[PDB]
Design a binder for these strands. Structure first.
Lengths: 56, 120, 122
RNA sequence: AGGACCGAACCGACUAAUGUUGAAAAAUUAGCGGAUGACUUGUGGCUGGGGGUGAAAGGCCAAUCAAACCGGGAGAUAGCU
RNA sequence: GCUCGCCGGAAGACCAAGGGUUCCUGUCCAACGUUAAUCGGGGCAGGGUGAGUCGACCCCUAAGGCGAGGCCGAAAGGCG
RNA sequence: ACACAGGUGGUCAGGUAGAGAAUACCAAGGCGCUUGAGAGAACUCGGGUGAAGGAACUAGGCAAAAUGGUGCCGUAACUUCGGGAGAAGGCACGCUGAUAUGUAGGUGAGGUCCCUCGCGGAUGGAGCUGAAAUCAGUCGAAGAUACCAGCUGGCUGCAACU
RNA sequence: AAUUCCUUGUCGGGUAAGUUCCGACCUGCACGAAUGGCGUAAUGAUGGCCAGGCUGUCUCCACCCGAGACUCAGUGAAAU
RNA sequence: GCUCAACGGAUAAAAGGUACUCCGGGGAUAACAGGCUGAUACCGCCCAAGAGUUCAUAUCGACGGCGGUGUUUGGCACCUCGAUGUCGGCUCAUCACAUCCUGGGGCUGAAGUAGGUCCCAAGGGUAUGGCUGUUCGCCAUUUAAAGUGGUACGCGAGCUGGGUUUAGAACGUCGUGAGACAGUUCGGUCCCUAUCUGCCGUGGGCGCUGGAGAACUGAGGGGGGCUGCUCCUAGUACGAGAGGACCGGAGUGGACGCAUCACUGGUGUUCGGGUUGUCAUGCCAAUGGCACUGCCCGGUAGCUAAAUGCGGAAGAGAUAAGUGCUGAAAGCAUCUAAGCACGAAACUUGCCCCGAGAUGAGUUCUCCCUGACCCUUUAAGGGUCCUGAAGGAACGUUGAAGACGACGACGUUGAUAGGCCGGGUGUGUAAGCGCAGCGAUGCGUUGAGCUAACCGGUACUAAUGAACCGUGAGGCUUAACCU
């Protein structure tokens, strides 16, 4: 009751075809600044949705 | 299973989550913004909003409460004096949540929780 | 609930506190007995003033349940003991002269009214 | 007074469960039990191969044992593989 | 720094065997701790082990080992 | 073999409760981990809840739950007269008052006393400490309130008991 | 019967029934006095048969709590 | 001259035992299972000494004969001894039909009800209690039945492990004895990191071709299928009577299966209150943490069965056995040949659910798009710019939707999740103040105080412009219409 003969490398390619990670393109920008973020978090500059959320 | 239980069981035993979120309530009122995981930022809202509602009335009988789980030497004058007009007098909506992104080097979602009014 | 291998008190006059339920009847597979419906009993103690023998196999009917009588409105009428009364297997009818039980509507739904009605309790 | 009734420390194997490519070279969790004795124990010794040790199973003798382990005769012998 | 939690006959304190540079400050982050590592019993340096009286030795010696003169044995070895 | 749920010698064990080294909150003291984040389904492991029925389950009450403290009562057969026996079967328990406004148990000044002088000796009972228990009345679901803490009876092969 | 096929002998008791249990019997194919005989209590890590309490063993499970089944990141196997 | 006679003789000199062992070889060789055969086994048919008060053949059969079966008890020694778990116990399948029950009805020593016997049929069904290792057996009560067989006399990469079939013990017997035993009991393990074929939910492609969106077809598959009790017809048929039925005409049940949480129970570790030990806010009160959710006493929302509601349909089509019409081969006769008609719990629909990968890739409606340039040179292929509809994706708030995915609600054209407000269910009259009572404790202010899920109210907190994917009327033809 063990694997006998090796599975095909096309079948290995097809089982690996089900990937869903994205290249995140395009990234979103703030309504007052062209700085990039994912569609629901803050920028690393304190800008967010044209509101400004973290001071310096 | 869970067919009316809307409480998040989150991670580790209930007695940890109790101790931790009762400590985090003291940590939140001290600095008025705290950073943690998105699940922890939302689970800190539970029973702390009723605790803010509890801090509104300045009567000597209500001054007996808000004292069983979270204590600190520097809230003793704000209790039953400021927490009303600053927060509890709003009638709900005492906090704000916002995801700040991911955790350093790993896929954990990170957020900040703040109080709905900032001191002037 | 009354079932196979249950020991009960008996509603028959000069009957002992101990009679054994050997079958719940109904021909098909059955879990528990039912009020106003038959059950198979053996006598585990006999009282000399009574009209039964120890170790004898007899027919009975359930006359009070701790589960209560409750079909028509869901409003329960309840009792503080489980008991049956003894029936003859050929001539029919309750074998005793008095019954110790509430003698409810489903017992008068049987052919027995003449020998149960000395004391109605509900 | 006690090869005495229950019982900590101390000891310890009987049932049950978990564990069983484990934390594991035999433990873990719960209970029942041994506890002035024909007992237990800290420390150092003494008993060896057909010999030891055993209120005695051919059990135990450093995981091994109807005869331990290592090194030699030994590349012994196999009408067989 | 403030706050919380658990153990509290231990999840504490002291002594010993057995191990062996482990102690401390001063830094370093390749490898190690089956990670992150800025920490470290890890790397690599530098500093540290002050005794008449403490544990050992002293002096006697149990079990046991050795063993003269002497004995047994080719002998290894052994008795007393 | 490991920074391994393991193995391992000697000395120590306060407060409150409690007979107590059981057992908990604690004390002094210590640690918060050498993968983390989260989630949550059939199923896997243990613990918790248990209606009405109950040993029917099973080879077997195994396992599990109930009993559980100790002062006063009350106890069979058999027996090596010891035992069986905590047989079996019952009462009481907080708090306060009234029993003994605190009894039993332990401890005890001066004086009387005997001398030798003297850390006197010895006789005694003012004082100190202090169980376990009882009864009434009121309160609770429940007072041996938690942890801790005995299932009971009968027939019988065989084996002295430890 | 720790000794006995057919045997659950044969009878009695317990039981709705009972190859089990308790008690007798003799016709032991083959017990027997130190290779001992027979009996008695507390007692037995002893075995068989019943009664009661209590109870999720079971009718029949139903729902919880703490840990795995899932998933993502870090470090990433073995038998075959 | 050696019965060395094991005789063609292994040495002035050699016997037994191993289930305590153990070594090399093996289905060459047995056992538990696979094949072959069917004497044995159970059954039928030819046939008939007889039984069946008559009568051989309703029913049953001595004798002789010829088969039906694979299928047992045996025979047999092929493939298996580098290792097919055996009996019984639990838990659960699939195929036969030699039919126990359920539907059909024939023959009869069948008036009727029945009994005896026969065969069309495997769609549904086919207990429970005690004794034993247990099948096998026995006993008590239930039943529409308490059918038989194949599948290693079905289910150990299934559960159990008492017997048989481990080391140790203990009894009876045989032997000189180690041993041996158609003599027997006590204690005695049950392993598994799931690869491939399979099964059961669920993502993602390719496809119908210019792209999207909403929904529905039915070639085909699955599910479903029996039955207990009672009453009317009716005391009808048959029959003095005794006794007592088909035919169709309803109601009511169980195992079993489904659904909801409304009742009745249960549980309900986000909650109300009492309490023993103790710690903590200085201490006291009030109050909280721990001690198994300390002990509990309880429980909303929810879920659940032990609760309640319901369930295996009516109808249509077509058959087998079987009954027939009309009729020729056989001028009669004949269910068959030509030609017509009926019939079973079977068979197929209808019912209920799936279902175009039905590649044999179904079908309607709606939405949208009317741009140019270059190269080889070409009805083929490649490149460039311009800037893009319909729609999707992203993102929340989170769910009655989940392991991951897939899917619902909606996102200020805002009640999607929460808090807050008014109240429910459920707890139980507290605190603070005083009073009665040495006091425990009780009393008034007080139906106090407390709240989550249920009901209603409310923008108080939170919920991006829209980037990105998607572009420009989309190849050929048969036939008709519009232009």
């Amino acid at each position: 009751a063990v694997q006998q003969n090796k599975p095909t490398r096309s079948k290995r390619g097809m089982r690996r075809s089900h990937d869903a990670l994205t290249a995140v393109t395009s990234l979103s920008v703030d309504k007052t600044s062209g700085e990039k973020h994912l569609r629901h978090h803050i920028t690393a500059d304190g800008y967010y949705r044209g509101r400004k959320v973290i001071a310096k | 299973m869970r067919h009316r239980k809307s409480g998040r069981q989150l991670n580790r035993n209930s007695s940890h989550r109790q101790a931790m979120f009762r400590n985090m309530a003291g940590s939140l009122v001290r600095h008025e913004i705290i950073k943690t995981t998105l699940p922890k930022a939302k689970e800190l809202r539970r029973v702390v909003e009723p605790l803010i509602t509890l801090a509104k009335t300045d009567s000597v009988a209500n001054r007996r409460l808000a004292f069983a789980r979270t204590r600190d030497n520097e809230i003793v004058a704000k209790l039953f004096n400021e927490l009303g007009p600053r927060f509890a007098s709003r009638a709900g909506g005492y906090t704000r949540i916002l995801k700040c992104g991911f955790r350093a080097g790993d896929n954990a979602p990170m957020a900040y929780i703040e109080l709905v009014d900032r001191s002037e | 609930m009354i079932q196979e291998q249950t020991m009960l008190n008996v509603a028959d006059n000069s009957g002992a506190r101990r009679v054994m339920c050997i079958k719940v009847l109904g021909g098909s597979h059955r879990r528990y007995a039912g009020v106003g419906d038959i059950i198979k009993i053996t006598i585990k103690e006999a009282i000399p003033r009574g009209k039964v023998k120890k170790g004898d196999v007899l027919k009975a009917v359930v006359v009070r349940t701790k589960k209560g009588v409750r079909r028509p409105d869901g409003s329960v009428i309840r009792f503080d003991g489980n008991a049956c009364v003894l029936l003859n297997n050929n001539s029919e009818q309750p074998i005793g002269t008095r019954i110790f039980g509430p003698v409810t509507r489903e017992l008068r739904s049987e052919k027995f009214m003449k020998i149960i009605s000395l004391a109605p309790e509900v």
